[PDB]
Design a protein around this ligand. Structure first.
Ligand SMILES: NC(=O)c1ccc[n+]([C@@H]2O[C@H](COP(=O)([O-])OP(=O)(O)OC[C@H]3O[C@@H](n4cnc5c(N)ncnc54)[C@H](OP(=O)(O)O)[C@@H]3O)[C@@H](O)[C@H]2O)c1
Ligand SMILES: C[C@H](CCC(=O)O)[C@H]1CC[C@H]2[C@@H]3CC[C@@H]4C[C@H](O)CC[C@]4(C)[C@H]3Cc3nnnn3[C@]12C
Ligand code: NA
Ligand code: NA
Ligand code: NA
Ligand code: NA
Length: 314
């Protein structure tokens, strides 16, 4: 169940989200990534920031070595952290991710965020009064370095994450552009459905990939605990009842029917096995209109620590 990207590669339309907070033991990423592959996931979304690429890579290598899948069956995404936007830092950052994951290439390498941070290995640079330290980098030069990673064969495809229309246009208009972004991975769910951005992306043959499609993990460091809980929504729950599915499955299927590639994080064996059932049923045009009606521009991520960054995309 795949979509063709604008560079000719194919992306599975359902992806497994791997982020877990630091209070989850690092062993769990290995267990749940194997469970995801066993359940039928074939797109796996990770990042240098997640501190999990060793365990996620081991899971992938394990399922290839045991004969369950071949390397070409798995679509593995990593992301360039914002302390590595300076062009000379991009290839070493990807090479380090590949060494940790024990992989020869990623299927997809993303710019994690347009909001550049002080260069270096320290992923959370903070000043003498605890403020996040920004950097000013032309993201077109970061992009040129991403392009060289594709030409070196280290990334099959390259894309971006957390870009707005203006930031996408900056790449599309870059002089001497070699490769468009294949995707823009953004926050997208029935409370923030990104309809105009989605329209724009489709018009440029850029795939919108939805994160927080089940309403986020609601980590109180990053998400307002007063925010409404997406999966408690009465329309999603009534549709779940109507279809004998679950609110999560309704929220996933909604994205597939609108041409969005959707991620789903779960570290729970039962919910991992549940989520792959998204391909078993369909929402009517009336159901889709009811879910479109939930849109309220609700951003679970309010990036408060990136206050005043010039590249803040919202
Ligand atoms: N590019 C970026 O900046 C960025 C930002 C955020 C996320 N991401 C990526 O997108 C992924 C997903 O987004 P997310 O981490 O915000 O989480 P999410 O996919 O919105 O999931 C939120 C929560 O839903 C629960 N869940 C999963 N399946 C469910 C089911 N069938 N029924 C009920 N609850 C269910 C999970 O809890 P359990 O684990 O307890 O099942 C999970 O913690 C991340 O892991 C990461 O790979 C990227
Ligand atoms: C849940 C986010 C991860 C999203 C993802 O799944 O890609 C958090 C985890 C780490 C944190 C990083 C962790 C390192 C550092 C911690 C600082 O106190 C705040 C800035 C930040 C870059 C934050 C920024 C942030 N703002 N809202 N969410 N975040 C993220 C990216
Ligand atoms: Na740090
Ligand atoms: Na513009
Ligand atoms: Na458009
Ligand atoms: Na199924």
């Amino acid at each position: 169940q795949c979509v063709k990207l604008n560079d000719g590669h194919f992306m599975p339309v359902l992806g497994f989200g791997t982020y877990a907070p630091p209070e989850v033991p690092r062993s769990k990423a290995l267990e749940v990534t194997k469970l995801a592959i066993e359940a039928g996931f074939r797109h796996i979304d990770s990042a240098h920031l997640y501190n999990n690429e060793e365990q996620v890579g081991l899971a992938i290598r394990s399922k290839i070595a045991d004969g369950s899948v071949k390397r070409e069956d798995i679509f593995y995404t990593s992301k360039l952290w914002s302390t590595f936007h300076r062009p000379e830092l991009v290839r070493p950052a990807l090479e380090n991710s590949l060494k940790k994951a024990q992989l020869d290439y990623v299927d997809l390498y993303l710019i994690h965020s347009p909001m550049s941070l002080k260069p270096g290995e320290e992923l959370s640079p903070t000043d003498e009064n605890g403020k996040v330290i920004f950097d000013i980098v032309d993201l077109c030069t970061t992009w040129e370095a991403m392009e060289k990673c594709k030409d070196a064969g280290l990334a099959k495809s390259i894309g971006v994450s957390n870009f707005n229309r203006r930031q996408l246009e900056m790449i599309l208009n870059k002089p001497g552009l070699k490769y468009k972004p294949v995707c823009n991975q953004v926050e997208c769910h029935p409370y923030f459905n990104r309809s105009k951005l989605l329209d724009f992306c489709k018009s440029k043959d850029i795939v919108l990939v939805a994160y927080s499609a089940l309403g986020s993990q609601r980590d109180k460091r990053w998400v307002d605990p007063n925010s409404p809980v997406l999966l408690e929504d009465p329309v999603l729950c009534a549709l779940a009842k109507k279809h004998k599915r679950t609110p999560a499955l309704i929220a996933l299927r909604y994205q597939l029917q609108r041409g969005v590639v959707v991620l789903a994080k779960s570290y729970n064996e039962q919910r991992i096995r549940q989520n792959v059932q998204v391909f078993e049923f369909q929402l009517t045009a009336e159901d889709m209109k009811a879910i479109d009606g939930l849109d309220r521009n609700l951003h679970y991520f309010n990036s408060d620590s990136f206050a005043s960054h010039p590249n803040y995309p919202y």
